[PDB]
Write a protein that binds this ligand. Structure first.
Ligand code: GDP
Ligand code: MG
Length: 386
């Protein structure tokens, strides 16, 4: 029945992200929509290790009248960096927590910048610790500050809901505290839209393997990432070489002929007229017009540390690694932003990349940076250039 939304608390350390998360689960538990997870349980977040990288993330779930939420919260700034860039945590929206007594702090800025770079589409703000601020005008001035900062990263600062409260008082069962948590959750319900179903997006399928079979022609295999491909419809073959257009004449799985393949399906797709030598791993099938090939882009990247399997020395301007996009490596040259001389292991930064061959790409596409077949970085395309 209820639509599902993924969110998380972001913001500077000590501003009350965890207290707020705990208060949400408490106040919703009390309305019959969650198990109360106490502060210590959320704060002592399990470390999860995946692809060399350890991230501490608390996962909590709750529901309002309208919606079901999965909510993430992390102890440290570095967990946010890694989750948001690697996509180990996805957010359809974020609750930005700012201490009203401190105002925005450097990770308040960094998390907003990250939200922009990795495509978090909406922010709601909880201005926390108002029990520490007795002056209403000071409160308004902090709020105005948060709005200016949000707008400076192109979020709609004038329209973003900002709820003022004390997460700590809510935890202590103060009624005014609790009402703020409920106003926060109403704003989340109404402002953060439920994301588009993968099935409704334009068809896209990364090609993993290509086959030329006697009396069948050219077959490509992979997983449909999004949308639906139907026998008889046209598809573009995008990336690496000039775009080509053809007709899907078949979709199949082991011992199963299909009329179509949808998001999540691992299928073989028969391409009418297409020569095996014109298709390769690293291209995508797509809805015609829906995605273009590019060589040049900006990305937010996280560079692994030595302990994660990464480099143990910095790189510099013109570094020339591989970029693993979906299924294949393409070499590219890295340009660093003005004011950045070097990128250390464990840093995150925005870079410009120029690949030696085009890839079907769009904002939000993730990739790995590799050196000699070893992953040294994780990125997400933040802007297409030209
Ligand atoms: N006075 C006050 N303190 C708070 C409030 N919310 C959190 N704190 C305290 O600020 C500290 C940091 O809170 P925490 O939720 O761990 O911050 P996080 O680092 O953002 O997750 C803890 O001592 C909290 O109890 C609040 O509304 N008022
Ligand atoms: Mg915390």
């Amino acid at each position: 029945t209820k639509p599902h939304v993924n969110i998380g608390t972001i913001g500077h350390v000590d501003h009350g992200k965890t207290t707020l998360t705990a208060a949400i689960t408490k106040v919703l538990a009390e309305k019959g929509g969650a198990e109360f997870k106490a502060y210590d349980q959320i704060d002592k977040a399990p470390e999860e290790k995946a692809r060399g990288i350890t991230i501490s993330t608390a996962h909590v779930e709750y529901e309002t009248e309208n919606r079901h939420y999965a909510h993430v919260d992390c102890p440290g700034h570095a967990d946010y960096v890694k989750n948001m860039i690697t996509g180990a945590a996805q957010m359809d929206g974020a609750i930005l927590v700012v201490s009203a007594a401190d105002g925005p702090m450097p990770q308040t800025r960094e998390h907003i910048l990250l939200a922009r770079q990795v495509g978090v589409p909406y922010i709601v703000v909880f201005l926390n610790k108002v029990d520490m601020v007795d002056d209403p005008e000071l409160l308004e001035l902090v709020e105005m500050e948060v709005r200016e900062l949000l707008s400076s990263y192109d979020f709609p600062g004038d329209d973003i809901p900002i709820i003022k409260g004390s997460a700590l008082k809510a935890l202590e069962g103060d009624e005014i505290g609790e009402e703020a948590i409920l106003k926060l959750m109403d704003a989340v319900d109404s402002y953060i839209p439920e994301p588009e179903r993968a099935i409704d997006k334009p068809f896209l399928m990364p090609i993993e393997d290509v086959f030329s079979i006697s009396g069948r022609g050219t077959v490509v295999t992979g997983r449909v990432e999004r949308g639906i491909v139907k026998v008889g419809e046209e598809v573009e073959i995008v990336g690496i070489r000039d775009t080509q257009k053809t007709t899907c004449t078949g979709v199949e799985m082991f011992r199963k002929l299909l009329d179509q393949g949808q998001a999540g399906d691992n299928v073989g797709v028969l391409l009418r007229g297409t020569k095996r030598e014109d298709v390769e791993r690293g291209q995508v099938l797509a809805k015609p017009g829906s995605i273009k090939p590019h060589t040049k882009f900006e990305a937010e990247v996280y560079i692994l540390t030595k302990e994660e399997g990464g480099r143990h020395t910095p790189f510099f301007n013109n570094y020339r690694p591989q970029f693993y996009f979906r299924t294949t490596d393409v070499t590219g040259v890295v340009t660093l932003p003005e004011g950045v001389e070097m990128v250390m292991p464990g840093d995150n930064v925005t870079i410009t990349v120029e690949l030696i061959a085009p890839i079907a790409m769009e904002e939000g596409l993730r990739f790995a940076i590799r050196e000699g077949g070893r992953t040294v970085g994780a990125g997400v395309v933040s802007k297409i250039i030209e």
